[PDB]
């Protein structure tokens, strides 16, 4: 528990992480700019250091999906918080 | 919702441990609930106690002439139950 996933902001995670996880239950590669888009954080806060702190917390890796364009996998331990995180967005 | 402006590691820790005290009937105090969460006892007071209270998670009581303790909600009920879940994820 140093995890730096206990450092994150409990909003930027319900957010992400779930957005993250219904993108591959569909298949789907998003772009940051989908994810920024799907999930409803503020781009400035994404690109500030937000994404950053997901990949330092061992929860996200980034990837080149193509020319110019980026996407974030879960990680596996990112992906059985995600699940977690959908039961907890039932409940607010 | 205040509840998402929270800090992750507070509201796992926090929630959890009084659900945890609830199941086995007991009433803790608050300097109870600070040491089993392992939060700092600067860090409950000086804000986090207060920002469960307005996210609607918990309610303070007094609960004698000594001692005061956290009643969970039923919002913060059902919350801490999938946080115990995360926890099993972290550990
Ligand atoms: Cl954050
Ligand atoms: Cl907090
Ligand atoms: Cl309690």
Redesign the interface.
């Known amino acids: 528990?140093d995890?730096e996933?206990?450092?994150?902001?409990?909003?930027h995670?319900?957010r992400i992480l779930p957005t993250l996880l219904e993108f591959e239950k569909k298949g789907y590669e998003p772009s940051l700019a989908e994810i920024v888009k799907a999930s409803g954080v503020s781009e400035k806060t994404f690109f500030m250091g937000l994404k950053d702190r997901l990949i330092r917390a061992g929860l996200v890796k980034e990837e080149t999906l193509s020319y110019r364009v980026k996407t974030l996998k879960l990680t596996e331990?990112g992906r059985?918080?995600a699940e977690?995180?959908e039961?907890?967005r039932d409940?607010?």
């Open positions: 528990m995890d996933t206990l450092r994150l902001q409990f909003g995670l319900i331990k059985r918080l977690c995180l039961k907890c409940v607010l």
